[PDB]
Amino acid sequence: GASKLRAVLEKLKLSRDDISTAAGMVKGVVDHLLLRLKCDSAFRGVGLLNTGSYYEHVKISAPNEFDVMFKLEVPRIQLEEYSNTRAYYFVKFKENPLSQFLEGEILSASKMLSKFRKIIKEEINDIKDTDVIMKRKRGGSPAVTLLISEKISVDITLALESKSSWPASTQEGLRIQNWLSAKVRKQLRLKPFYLVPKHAKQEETWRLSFSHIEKEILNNHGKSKTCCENKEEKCCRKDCLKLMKYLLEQLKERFKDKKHLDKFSSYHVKTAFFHVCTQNPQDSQWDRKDLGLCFDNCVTYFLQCLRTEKLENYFIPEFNLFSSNLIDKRSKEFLTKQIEYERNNEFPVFDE
Ligand SMILES: [Zn+2]
């Protein structure tokens, strides 16, 4: 019930101070690293892009794991879609500071990746108890991992910043008109977009990223401009997204040996949550006193995506995150059985 869920949220608060304290450490090493690249290197126009769970105020676990994005302003970019993927692109340019990594017209992800990796190893040795370590490449993003005081892992993604208007594959995405309004949609789509190096599954492809927009929505999320700015307009949208993330995290924990749920990530949960916000656009559909109902809305929609094997990227609707090419049918059916069981029994995974 809604009291069991409120107890989970209270338990998650006990971890607030360790996450924020660790975020202070990350920021200290990141600003130091950033000012070496910024001063003099092949990545001079670099800048910090403050995105990810922590900056969205929905990081509720893993105080030793942070994702950080560096952005790189580039001269005007021309894109070329990789086959019919809708999310993966080759980068071209319409005498620029990236000429080093070009191969003909195409900007080489793996070459730029490789210099970035080396340039940071070189500047890291000069930084107090911080090292570079290699996790699974995952297509090139995260591009490099830092280990701060040999305790905190910081995954750092290099992202190109394009101030051009969004690619065609986003035209029907970001369907926030009935929720956040058409005015907000136009305003958000005048913002830049980002490209992160990412194998599409041998190629030099990049994938669109809209983390800065996901942060904007999450921190300005009501139909009312004053949603969550006073006690009469405290909604439970964020509490539901935190509970969805914690649900998945706790389920993955119960399979740490075989790791059957390894392919599922909080990005999947976050994408499904944005679709529910679109489907339930009124702030009264997220009254704090209806927490148990809104959480059920989030869980059944997430079950529906697993059963239909369809979870469309919130910005690129033809990019299906749950297609069998990415997540096999068997993993989705296994996660469906667990979540179904938990939903029908008032979430015994949350019992103390
Ligand atoms: Zn709110």
From Swiss-Prot:
Changing K245R: Reduced enzyme activity. Decreased ubiquitination and SQSTM1-mediated autophagic degradation. Expressed in the monocytic cell line THP1. Changing R136E: Reduced nucleotidyltransferase activity. The modification N6-methyllysine is found at K337. The record marks K27, L35 as: Important for preferential detection of curved long DNA. Changing N345A: Abollshed interaction with the SPSB3 component of the ECS(SPSB3) complex. Changing D296A: Reduced interaction with the SPSB3 component of the ECS(SPSB3) complex. Its cofactor is Mg(2+); Mn(2+); Zn(2+). The N-terminal disordered part (1-160) is phosphorylated by AURKB during the G2-M transition, blocking CGAS liquid phase separation and preventing activation. Phosphorylation at Tyr-55 by BLK promotes cytosolic retention. Localizes into the nucleus following dephosphorylation at Tyr-55. Phosphorylation at Ser-266 activates the nucleotidyltransferase activity. Dephosphorylation at Ser-266 by PPP6C impairs its ability to bind GTP, thereby inactivating it. Changing K245 to A/E: Abolishes stimulation of interferon production. A motif (KKH-loop) lies at residues 258-260. The modification (Microbial infection) Deamidated asparagine is found at N50, N220. Residues 13-55, 215-238 are annotated as: DNA-binding. Its EC number is 2.7.7.86. Changing K245Q: Acetylation-mimetic mutant; reduced enzyme activity. Changing K186A: Impaired association with collided ribosomes in response to translation stress. Does not affect interaction with histones H2A and H2B. The modification 5-glutamyl polyglutamate is found at E122. Its main location: nucleus. This is Cyclic GMP-AMP synthase. It comes from Homo sapiens (Human).
